Design a protein around this nucleic acid. Structure first.
Ligand SMILES: Nc1nc(=O)n([C@@H]2CS[C@H](COP(=O)(O)OP(=O)(O)OP(=O)(O)O)O2)cc1F
Ligand SMILES: [Mn+2]
Ligand SMILES: [Mn+2]
Ligand SMILES: [Mn+2]
Ligand SMILES: [Mn+2]
Ligand SMILES: [Mn+2]
Ligand SMILES: [Mn+2]
Ligand code: NA
Ligand code: NA
Ligand code: NA
Ligand code: NA
Length: 327
DNA sequence: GTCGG
DNA sequence: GCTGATGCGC
DNA sequence: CCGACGGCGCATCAGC
């Protein structure tokens, strides 16, 4: 199935360990980068040397690849898997609301299992209460077929609140994925621009009023994080939904951001820094001589952003990650 | 952990 | 109130 | 203790 899959899984496992157990956020990103680059490499890897040529594979990862190529495993990962404290910390971070820091506190207080975690609800904040409540459903992927029915509801209900709203389903759906992990809804309204001043609320209560949104993780004036569910013919899993209100006049920088992937975005924002610019979901600005962002540059399309940084435009579908296959 | 300066 | 970290997530 | 690594919304606490 997956060309070099053994290696990329290995590197993914290490990344997760550095993040969740070591709290080494930059080592985590080194391994992710490594995993991404190898996955998109179109040849089989014969050695750590070969791999090392790829940007973001260095000495220590080559070594590991050698070890893995030679033995079909990695001793560093055997020791880690066996370490039950590492394994429970890792596990707890898969609940939404719990990161490396809380997962560690919980495990050092004898909370190690799903069963233990439910026993100690009173220890959890609201966000964690809800991620635990839907832990199972949130592990499932969303078929594009079901994404369409959700778009239909979201779009219809936005129009019914105020037809001047425009709602756009971004994330992995806009990239054409046949399944998505969540639903990312990007929202504009002409009253909200970068120079103006309860636009997101209305939409959320409307979506709750017709019982599509079922819970709330967090909510502010511009970003809503919650749970949703299709009505049953006769039940559908609950699902994560992200609703983002961005300023009407910065739609392109915002839709670029909200389309992802995550890895595409940090690579893009990294390539810009070396060219001399800084990008966020609102603007692309030139970095001053002192690394200080200057005034925003004009953007009339997604391609204008790529253009400023001397990148070839890439349609949404080519902003996903890929892997390659062996026979 | 990698890169680069 | 304000600012500024830290934790968490996308 | 070579240093930067993407960038920021929401929740919370700390120090003023
Ligand atoms: N680290 C991240 N940086 C980003 O810019 N993003 C952006 C913000 S919103 C857009 C989509 O994020 P999601 O986490 O919903 O990821 P996705 O839709 O690509 O993937 P999925 O199908 O939701 O698993 O990507 C996400 C990150 F995780
Ligand atoms: Mn495949
Ligand atoms: Mn294989
Ligand atoms: Mn490739
Ligand atoms: Mn205890
Ligand atoms: Mn998504
Ligand atoms: Mn999302
Ligand atoms: Na390299
Ligand atoms: Na988590
Ligand atoms: Na308790
Ligand atoms: Na459920």
């Amino acid at each position: 199935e997956t060309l070099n899959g053994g290696i990329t899984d290995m590197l993914t496992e290490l990344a997760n360990f550095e993040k969740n157990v070591s709290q080494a956020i930059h080592k985590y990103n080194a391994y992710r980068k490594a995993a991404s680059v190898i996955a998109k490499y179109p040849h089989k890897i014969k050695s750590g040397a070969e791999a090392k040529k790829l940007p973001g594979v260095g000495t220590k990862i080559a070594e590991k690849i050698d070890e893995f190529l030679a033995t079909g495993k990695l001793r560093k990962l055997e020791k880690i898997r066996q370490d039950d404290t590492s394994s429970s910390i890792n596990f707890l971070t898969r609940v939404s609301g719990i990161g490396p820091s809380a997962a560690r506190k919980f495990v050092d207080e004898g909370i190690k299992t799903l069963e233990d975690l439910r026993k100690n609800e009173d220890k959890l904040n609201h966000h964690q209460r809800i991620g635990l409540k839907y832990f199972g459903d949130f592990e499932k992927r969303i078929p594009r077929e079901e994404m369409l029915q959700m778009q239909d509801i979201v779009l219809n209900e936005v129009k019914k609140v105020d037809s001047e709203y425009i709602a756009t389903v971004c994330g992995s759906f806009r990239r054409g994925a046949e399944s998505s992990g969540d639903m990312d809804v990007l929202l504009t309204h002409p009253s909200f621009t970068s120079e103006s001043t309860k636009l997101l609320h209305q939409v959320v209560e409307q979506l709750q009023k017709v019982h599509f949104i079922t819970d709330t993780l967090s909510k502010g004036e511009t970003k809503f994080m919650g749970v949703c569910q299709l009505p049953s013919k006769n039940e559908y899993p609950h699902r994560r939904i992200d609703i983002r209100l961005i300023p009407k006049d910065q739609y392109y920088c915002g839709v670029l951001y909200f389309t992802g992937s995550d890895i595409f975005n940090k690579n893009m924002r990294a390539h810009a820094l070396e060219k001399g610019f800084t990008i966020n979901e609102y603007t692309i600005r030139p970095l001053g001589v002192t690394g200080v962002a200057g005034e925003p540059l004009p953007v009339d399309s997604e391609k204008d952003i790529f253009d400023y940084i001397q990148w070839k435009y890439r349609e949404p579908k080519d902003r996903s990650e890929h892997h390659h296959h062996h026979h």
